[PDB]
């Protein structure tokens, strides 16, 4: 499971005490700012979240009489609390360091503004606790657009991806695609480490695009944005997010790769708010 | 209908008199030089044509005695006569200006040589009185050759045109093509103003080539020269003119766009008088 | 048949005597260095081969007493012997010149080292006595790889070759290919002089690639290395040599020309000792 040790490693956080508590789990992405706790109000809710002590919390705490503040830092270090981070380069109170050691609660110092750090921490947490799955298809980057090509076996997915590569686009994954929903509506795809840089074509066998075309033809990971479904305003649902989908009929008399290129171009255009299907719908009136 | 007003507007002709006659119709493209009329010989034939008075006509007229010339300019201004143009920057006779006002015959002065003006006027007239029709297919400019792509629905006409556009060629019209036979064997095609710059592709929908590819990918009008008929020394007759036609079978294992490009190249070559089908026919002997 | 006259012409060899013997046949590619003959030992074996007299032979011959050497040069000039070449710019013995004239044995002087000349002569001989045949298919040079495209009629061989030409590759022969096995595992292909530079495409007819695309699109001859068999570690046997073969299925949804390009690239890679099918076979373990 995800533990504070992973957090400290990703951001190279400065540990001050509570090293024995680095094996504590971080169950959610939510973050807590225990201001009310500084005033003596404690509760179970949010106790298992990372706690951030910034100017708001410490400016109040430091105005407390010693007899009133007594035990509040200790009560903050509950067993389930994965970490307490003193932000804005503030000095952690001696009582807190003491409590962190006694209760083995990871205590960290950060020089970052509280709000900014909170955003960075939660983003990492969402990335780590990302729902994951795998999909059959080919992931390619076309004009900066992550395109997932799907369709029945033999339809020409890998052959079309090869032509796209030949045309200057990048391969991310062939056959199987590992997908991670690292945040709301953000799907990141990558090839299994085993078939990285590989593309298999009936008749030719397995080829290495990196070896054949160089570094400019590959990309380790890419956010999915467009599903091109090859077949003999729709969408494709993957996990909890839906991405634009275009179903292109395959028949002689056309270059599927070109269609995909234009679909990616049209997509970026639509993203800018420009939609030709509407432009004409109005021109008709 | 076509009236003298349209003529004066197109060439910004200098009107001297007969403004009330600008609503007179110009029925044909033929032009008249009334020399015999200067000698007193009048007839119905050609009276409804634009009349040009150049050096030949006026040098004779100006040698006439006043009593003999009397009424000849008036008899020139017949009701059906749409316009009288004094060319070569010559001075229109007072009698002519007078007659033009009395009979409301548009009187124009031009500084151009009679023969040259005649050619320019008739060319405009043929353009205006051009026979017109519409055709299903896609018109593209490939290596300067106006190519009309035809073939059954779904064969891949628009998809192939899109690939040609992607390859640097220009789109003139998708789906419907307005054709004008502006002169003998000269067919000009253009897209209906409604679908200008548009191309529709099954699966993607309607796209704007101008927005997607820029100005270098479009062309307002183009003379048709080659018909590429996609199918699962021939010609295609359109109105009163026949254009070269090549029937290309569509099947996997080939890039139709490339075939079209070569067909256009071969066409220009044939135009230069070079024909490979003959070159080999001789090499065989 | 192959005669000494052809040999002298190809290398512009310096004839010293025996012109009347230039019509003698050169039956094999083997070459003889008659050292033992200098010592008086003669035999039928190798007598019908070109004979080379270098330092080894002449340094021994010149040490012989006149009575012992008598007749040895004459016995060297057997009727079937097509030619005797004195290499290393050595002086042919008077007795040899005399014998060559008497027996009409072509006598040549060469300034080249014996071993080097032997290699050059035999190479020419193998080229000349090359087994020959003709094959249906299209020969193109793709990234320096001689690719023979085969497959049933209508599959798209010539159309695919045309696309390859359009993509910068070179045409060697369309329809029929003249093959010459000029040495072990070395097959050279060329188009019949009659259809040189020509390519025929259904619908367009016969075109001249040289006229249409210029000199950079043609190649007179090319060694075959890869067979791409279009179909709706294998090899293709031609004469006595086998060349790598890849069978590519043709179906919509793919650009066959691109597949061929990658196959040629993969081939050069495999030649360098790099095989991706193995790279992955190991990565799986």
């Amino acid at each position: 499971m995800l533990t504070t040790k992973s957090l400290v490693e990703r951001f190279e956080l400065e540990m001050i005490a509570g090293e024995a508590g680095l094996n504590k789990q971080i169950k959610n992405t939510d973050i807590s700012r225990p201001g009310l706790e500084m005033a003596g109000y404690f509760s179970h809710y949010a106790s298992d979240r990372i706690q951030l002590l910034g100017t708001t919390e410490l400016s109040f705490y430091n105005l407390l009489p010693d007899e009133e503040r007594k035990g509040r830092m200790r009560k903050l270090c509950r067993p389930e609390t994965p970490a307490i981070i003193v932000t804005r380069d503030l000095e952690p109170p001696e009582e807190l360091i003491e409590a962190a050691k006694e209760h083995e609660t990871p205590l960290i110092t950060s020089k970052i503004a509280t709000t900014q750090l909170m955003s960075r921490l939660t983003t990492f947490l969402e990335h780590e606790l990302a729902r994951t799955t795998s999909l059959h298809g080919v992931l390619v980057d076309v004009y900066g657009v992550g395109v997932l090509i799907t369709g029945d076996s033999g339809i020409g997915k890998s052959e079309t991806a090869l032509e796209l590569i030949k045309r200057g686009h990048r391969l991310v994954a062939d056959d199987n695609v590992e997908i991670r929903e690292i945040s709301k509506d953000e799907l990141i795809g990558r090839a299994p480490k085993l078939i990285e840089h590989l593309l298999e074509i009936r008749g030719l066998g397995i080829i290495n695009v990196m070896t054949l075309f160089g570094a400019g033809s590959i990309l380790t990971e890419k956010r999915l944005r467009l599903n091109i479904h090859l077949e003999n305003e729709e969408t494709l649902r993957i996990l909890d997010t839906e991405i634009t989908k275009k179903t292109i009929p395959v028949r002689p008399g056309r270059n599927v790769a070109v269609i995909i290129e234009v679909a990616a171009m049209n997509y970026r255009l639509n993203i800018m708010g420009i939609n030709t299907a509407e432009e004409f719908n109005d021109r008709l009136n």
Side-chain angles (χ1 to χ4, degrees), chain A:
Chain A
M1 56 193 188
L2 182 61
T3 64
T4 306
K5 183 181 182 182
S6 297
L7 186 73
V8 178
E9 296 185 310
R10 204 288 188 179
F11 300 104
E12 293 183 57
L13 303 175
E14 181 62 31
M15 281 285 284
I16 303 302
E19 292 64 40
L22 282 182
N23 41 34
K24 296 187 176 183
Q25 186 194 181
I26 297 174
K27 295 178 177 175
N28 42 264
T29 63
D30 301 287
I31 298 180
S32 162
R33 288 197 63 163
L36 286 166
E37 280 77 359
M38 298 301 92
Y41 305 99
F42 299 84
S43 63
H44 280 46
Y45 194 70
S47 72
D48 71 335
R49 300 177 183 182
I50 291 170
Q51 310 291 314
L52 302 187
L53 294 177
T55 299
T56 294
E57 297 70 27
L58 300 180
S59 64
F60 177 88
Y61 180 79
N62 289 313
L63 289 173
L64 289 169
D66 296 65
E67 64 279 357
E68 287 203 298
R69 58 200 267 175
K70 180 185 179 181
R72 288 184 186 174
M73 283 304 178
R74 182 170 183 177
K75 288 181 178 181
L76 202 181
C77 298
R78 286 147 154 290
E80 341 82 65
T81 307
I84 297 173
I85 308 172
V86 178
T87 66
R88 292 192 183 283
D89 200 40
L90 295 173
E91 184 63 39
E94 297 295 304
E95 302 89 309
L96 174 54
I97 293 173
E98 187 197 306
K101 293 182 175 180
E102 174 59 57
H103 292 39
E104 308 193 315
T105 298
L107 180 60
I108 300 162
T109 52
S110 176
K111 313 172 182 181
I112 304 169
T114 314
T115 296
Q116 187 180 71
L117 181 66
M118 188 191 108
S119 179
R120 297 180 175 176
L121 294 177
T122 323
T123 298
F124 166 65
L125 299 180
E126 297 197 316
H127 177 87
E128 294 300 296
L129 305 182
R131 195 175 158 202
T132 65
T133 187
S134 188
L135 284 172
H136 190 81
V138 60
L139 215 206
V140 297
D141 173 40
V142 185
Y143 299 129
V145 180
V147 181
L148 202 219
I149 305 174
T150 53
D152 302 327
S153 174
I155 197 70
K157 297 182 297 302
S158 293
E159 285 81 6
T160 296
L162 179 59
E163 170 158 28
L164 288 171
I165 296 301
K166 191 67 184 184
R167 293 169 75 81
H169 305 298
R170 307 171 188 278
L171 174 68
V172 179
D174 183 50
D175 201 324
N176 308 74
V177 188
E178 309 189 326
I179 305 294
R180 293 173 98 289
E181 190 180 56
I182 63 173
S183 74
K184 187 62 173 299
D185 295 318
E186 176 168 45
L187 300 174
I188 305 302
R190 61 180 298 145
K193 185 64 67 65
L194 183 60
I195 58 175
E196 181 171 56
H197 301 164
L198 307 188
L199 187 61
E200 184 173 53
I201 297 297
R202 288 182 176 69
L204 297 191
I206 302 174
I207 65 173
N208 189 309
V209 295
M210 235 306 270
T211 309
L212 288 180
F213 304 105
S217 71
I218 56 157
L219 179 60
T220 306
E221 53 173 44
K222 180 69 181 180
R223 176 176 187 168
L224 325 203
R225 291 289 198 183
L226 179 65
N227 174 216
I228 290 299
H229 191 72
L230 306 180
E231 192 172 65
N232 281 300
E233 301 179 63
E234 295 184 60
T235 61
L236 170 62
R237 178 179 186 177
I238 299 176
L239 295 177
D240 194 62
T241 86
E242 306 211 310
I243 61 177
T244 300
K245 173 185 177 185
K246 300 294 175 188
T247 298
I248 309 302
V250 181
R251 175 177 174 173
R254 54 264 280 157
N255 183 307
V256 179
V258 170
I259 303 298
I260 289 179
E261 289 186 326
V262 178
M265 289 177 256
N266 201 217
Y267 176 74
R268 299 183 64 95
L269 185 66
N270 292 169
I271 295 300
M272 295 184 270
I274 304 304
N275 191 302
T276 310
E278 291 174 48
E279 167 186 55
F280 181 65
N281 179 55
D282 293 307
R283 207 185 296 184
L284 287 175
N285 306 316

